[PDB]
Design a protein around this motif. Structure first.
Motif, PDB file in Angstrom:
ATOM      1  N   UNK A  23      67.699  -3.810  79.748  1.00  0.00           N
ATOM      2  CA  UNK A  23      68.700  -2.937  80.349  1.00  0.00           C
ATOM      3  C   UNK A  23      69.697  -3.758  81.161  1.00  0.00           C
ATOM      4  N   UNK A  24      69.182  -4.757  81.860  1.00  0.00           N
ATOM      5  CA  UNK A  24      70.001  -5.625  82.691  1.00  0.00           C
ATOM      6  C   UNK A  24      70.256  -6.957  81.991  1.00  0.00           C
ATOM      7  N   UNK A  25      70.472  -6.890  80.689  1.00  0.00           N
ATOM      8  CA  UNK A  25      70.683  -8.083  79.881  1.00  0.00           C
ATOM      9  C   UNK A  25      72.066  -8.679  80.132  1.00  0.00           C
ATOM     10  N   UNK A  26      72.961  -7.859  80.658  1.00  0.00           N
ATOM     11  CA  UNK A  26      74.309  -8.306  80.939  1.00  0.00           C
ATOM     12  C   UNK A  26      74.383  -9.154  82.192  1.00  0.00           C
ATOM     13  N   UNK A  27      75.352 -10.057  82.232  1.00  0.00           N
ATOM     14  CA  UNK A  27      75.542 -10.942  83.375  1.00  0.00           C
ATOM     15  C   UNK A  27      76.178 -10.189  84.537  1.00  0.00           C
ATOM     16  N   UNK A  28      76.850  -9.097  84.213  1.00  0.00           N
ATOM     17  CA  UNK A  28      77.506  -8.272  85.216  1.00  0.00           C
ATOM     18  C   UNK A  28      76.501  -7.344  85.881  1.00  0.00           C
ATOM     19  N   UNK A  29      75.345  -7.192  85.232  1.00  0.00           N
ATOM     20  CA  UNK A  29      74.225  -6.424  85.771  1.00  0.00           C
ATOM     21  C   UNK A  29      74.579  -4.940  85.892  1.00  0.00           C
ATOM     22  N   UNK A  30      73.773  -4.217  86.650  1.00  0.00           N
ATOM     23  CA  UNK A  30      73.980  -2.798  86.877  1.00  0.00           C
ATOM     24  C   UNK A  30      73.663  -2.468  88.343  1.00  0.00           C
ATOM     25  N   UNK A  31      74.236  -3.264  89.235  1.00  0.00           N
ATOM     26  CA  UNK A  31      73.997  -3.117  90.666  1.00  0.00           C
ATOM     27  C   UNK A  31      75.140  -2.376  91.343  1.00  0.00           C
ATOM     28  N   UNK A  32      76.102  -1.928  90.552  1.00  0.00           N
ATOM     29  CA  UNK A  32      77.213  -1.167  91.086  1.00  0.00           C
ATOM     30  C   UNK A  32      76.855   0.294  91.226  1.00  0.00           C
ATOM     31  N   UNK A  33      75.953   0.573  92.164  1.00  0.00           N
ATOM     32  CA  UNK A  33      75.406   1.910  92.376  1.00  0.00           C
ATOM     33  C   UNK A  33      74.588   2.333  91.161  1.00  0.00           C
ATOM     34  N   UNK A  34      73.367   1.814  91.077  1.00  0.00           N
ATOM     35  CA  UNK A  34      72.485   2.089  89.947  1.00  0.00           C
ATOM     36  C   UNK A  34      71.800   3.447  90.096  1.00  0.00           C
ATOM     37  N   UNK A  35      72.258   4.223  91.079  1.00  0.00           N
ATOM     38  CA  UNK A  35      71.781   5.587  91.302  1.00  0.00           C
ATOM     39  C   UNK A  35      70.306   5.596  91.685  1.00  0.00           C
ATOM     40  N   UNK A  36      69.888   4.547  92.378  1.00  0.00           N
ATOM     41  CA  UNK A  36      68.520   4.437  92.854  1.00  0.00           C
ATOM     42  C   UNK A  36      68.409   5.076  94.234  1.00  0.00           C
TER      43      UNK A  36
END
Length: 36
Positions: A23-36
């Motif tokens: 899911x987080x295979x991208x270098x840009x990640x998913x930390x831009x409000x991952x709705x956690x």
């Protein structure tokens, strides 16, 4: 240190780990409000 208590959970951990990495295979990640 062998433990057979949560040995099945360790297998599920592999799956959840693989999912996270996939899911987080991208270098840009998913930390831009991952709705956690």
């Amino acid at each position: 240190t062998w433990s057979g208590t949560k040995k099945r959970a360790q297998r599920i951990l592999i799956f959840l780990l693989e999912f996270l990495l996939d899911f987080c295979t991208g270098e840009d990640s998913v930390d831009g409000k991952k709705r956690q």
